[PDB]
Amino acid sequence: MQIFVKTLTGKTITLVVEPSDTIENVKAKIQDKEGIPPDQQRLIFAGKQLEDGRTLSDYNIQKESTLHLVLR
């Protein structure tokens, strides 16, 4: 399973993930890729604000889903 995270500059991050991965896990991956602090990261999928403790599956994030790093 793979998901795409678009940075604030529109750069695409490709991540290998599992359905039970938490948002917090995803943030750790983004930090490895881009050097962005987890506490600086705010993610959206389908207009939903994503919380650290919830899983990709909780938010119906599927194979090939695209998340955005946002300011708000």
Residues in touch with Zn ion (CB under 5 A): 18, 21, 25, 37, 39
Compute the least distance from the CB of residue 24 to Zn ion, in Å: 10
CA distance readout (Å), 35 to 12, 24, 61: 14, 15, 24
- In the complex, minimum distance from the CB of residue 5 to Zn ion, in angstroms, rounded to a whole number: 14
Q: Smaller CB distance to Zn ion: residue 37 or 46?
A: 37
| Strands of the 48-49 sheet, one edge to the other | 12-16, 2-6, 66-69, 43-45, 48-49
Least Cβ distance, residue 23 to Zn ion (angstroms):
11
